[PDB]
Design a protein around this ligand. Structure first.
Ligand SMILES: [Ca+2]
Ligand SMILES: [Ca+2]
Ligand SMILES: [Ca+2]
Length: 433
């Protein structure tokens, strides 16, 4: 965690912006949380900052004999040592592990889980778990998408651990409106090959696209050899490597995911406190994406998604925060003046109505991003083959135009309502220059 903080730049948010995520409540849904008592016996990382602790899977028991959820949760907001990215956020925990090691305390309708947390104050919900369904869009993926479009919860899912083969993304990681996280390498070279290059996508990281050919995961993060809170009840075999009695090493898209959840608590605190707006889930996703780092595989790409989180870049984005509704055939139009010499990144993100588990494509409302340079050159969203205006996107509820070396001059940024069956549809934009 001390290392991932520096990679995703959670350190610059913290030292130069003062962002440790105070005021933000992050809910985690995993196995359990150390001793399972929200009193003096709770692991130092979490003691006194648990807004609520719910036992969902075993009755009156939210303890962690496994190890998974304590470690995950540490990476979010742990605030003793080896601190999570948002050490000043408070914690809602839903323990879903049952009496046999399964996640049997998840409700049939996942909206019941997110509303439980939303009512405890939580506005971000992080889930290091999935069913290895190789990219299918499930009922669970559908209840995830419904919930977000209706409620201001940013919901995160790990991509899964069935890489490096493509079409391996796990549900509900396949949901449109979730931020889905795969793992790059932490930088602890003494471990060594699973952690010696921050630009290296991890073997196990599940890879895109989903069944209908969308880009998942959305972003990346260190999630090999992550030092985080160690459960007093977990044995050595749940970990990659020992460290001491209160901290230990794990690796997984499950370790990457809570880093990005913490980075959203930090990103969210900054919007509300320093920018006068509560960012919708769509903006929060767009800002991560616009700010994220090409590891060197290029775009589009199912292995890295839109890149490896880079938090300082996401903090001061120019934005639209869902303030422009759109019905079919209308358009919203904005101007942005670019300087030559720096890249210009524009991410269009919407919270799409939920799709069907059985359609050819999950997309429902189709918005099109359309950029127009000073000199008349045109880019459409996600078209990275020259010329950049002949390949229109009809699968994705993310649309990106990224230019290495833009012109000095005004760019037009237009979002077009191509076909908006369940409208009107709001959208966010994030621009990094
Ligand atoms: Ca490596
Ligand atoms: Ca489109
Ligand atoms: Ca093209």
């Amino acid at each position: 965690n001390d290392v991932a903080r520096g990679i995703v730049k959670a350190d610059v948010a913290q030292n130069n912006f003062g962002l440790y995520g105070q005021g933000q409540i992050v809910a985690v849904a995993d196995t359990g949380l150390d001793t399972g008592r929200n009193d003096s016996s709770m692991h130092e990382a979490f003691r006194g900052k648990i807004t609520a602790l719910y036992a969902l899977g075993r009755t009156n028991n939210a303890n962690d004999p496994n190890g998974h959820g304590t470690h995950v949760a540490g990476s979010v907001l742990g605030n003793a040592t080896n601190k999570g990215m948002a050490p000043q956020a408070n914690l809602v925990f839903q323990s879903i592990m049952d009496s046999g090691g399964g996640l049997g305390g998840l409700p049939a309708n996942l909206q019941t889980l997110f509303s439980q947390a939303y009512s405890a104050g939580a506005r971000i919900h992080t889930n290091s778990w999935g069913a290895p369904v190789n990219g299918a869009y499930t009922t669970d993926s559908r209840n995830v998408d419904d919930y977000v479009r209706k409620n201001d919860m940013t919901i995160l899912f790990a991509a899964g651990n069935e890489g490096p083969g493509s079409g391996t993304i796990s549900a509900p990681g396949t949901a449109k409106n979730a931020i889905t996280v795969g793992a790059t390498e932490n930088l602890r070279p003494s471990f060594g090959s699973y952690a010696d290059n921050i630009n290296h996508v991890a073997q196990f990281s599940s890879r895109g696209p989903t069944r209908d050919g969308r880009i998942k995961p959305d972003v990346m993060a260190p999630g090999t050899y992550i030092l985080s809170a160690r459960s007093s009840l977990a044995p050595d075999s749940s970990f990659w490597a020992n460290h001491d009695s209160k901290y230990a090493y794990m690796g997984g898209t499950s370790m990457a995911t809570p880093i990005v959840a913490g980075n959203v608590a930090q990103l969210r605190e900054h919007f509300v406190k320093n920018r006068g707006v509560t960012p919708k889930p769509s903006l929060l996703k767009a800002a991560l994406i616009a700010g994220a780092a090409d590891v060197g595989l290029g775009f589009p790409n199912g292995n890295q998604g839109w890149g490896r989180v880079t938090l300082d870049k996401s903090l001061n984005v120019a934005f639209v925060n869902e303030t422009s509704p759109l019905s079919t055939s209308q358009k919203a139009t904005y101007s942005f003046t670019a300087q030559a010499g720096k890249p210009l990144k524009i991410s269009l993100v919407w919270s799409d109505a939920p799709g069907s588990t059985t359609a050819s494509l999950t997309l429902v409302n189709d918005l099109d991003l359309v950029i127009t340079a000073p000199n008349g050159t045109k880019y459409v969203g996600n078209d990275f083959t020259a010329p950049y205006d002949n390949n229109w996107d009809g699968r994705n509820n993310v649309e990106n135009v990224f230019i290495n070396a833009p012109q000095s001059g005004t760019y037009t940024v237009e979002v077009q309502a191509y076909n908006v069956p369940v409208g009107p549809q709001t959208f966010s934009l994030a621009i990094v220059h």
